[PDB]
Amino acid sequence: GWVRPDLGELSKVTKVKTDRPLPENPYHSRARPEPNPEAEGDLKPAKHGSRLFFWTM
Amino acid sequence: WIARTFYDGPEKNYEKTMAILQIEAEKAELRLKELEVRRLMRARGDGPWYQYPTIDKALIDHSPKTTPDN
């Protein structure tokens, strides 16, 4: 009683019932380094301007 | 008469000098601080400055790759 599969049936993506636990870290990755402080705040004018040599602005 | 019509009192120049000296002293200390901050950021790389690009991780493709072991 074997019915031969039709065209494009064995290439389907199918689902599997498994009790094997999902590997939580399959890549064996380390801990990612902490990001940069990403500072945030409100802009204010430069203190005494450019402060380049004799320029007052 | 000459003092009354051409010149001002000593307090004016005194306090103007005080303000000028404050401005210049703060500028000097800010210049030293900025030089030190630049040195620290260039050495350690943890600051907003001297941030050099690395590969964007959004380019990586996370899909089955025709072979189980990547």
Ligand SMILES: CCCCCCCCCCCCCCCCC[C@@H](O)O[C@H](CO[C@H](O)CCCCCCCCCCCCCCC)COP(=O)(O)OCC[N+](C)(C)C
């Ligand atoms: C017997 C007399 C003895 C005294 C002789 C006095 C001689 C006076 C002439 C010499 C002046 C010296 C130079 C002074 C230049 C700077 C003066 C300047 O600071 O004063 C300004 C005013 O400048 C004057 O108007 C300049 C006068 C220029 C003329 C001098 C006399 C000779 C003029 C000749 C002209 C000839 C024309 C042709 C005729 C035929 C206003 O100053 P200001 O920044 O507000 O000051 C703030 C403080 N306050 C408020 C108390 C004043």
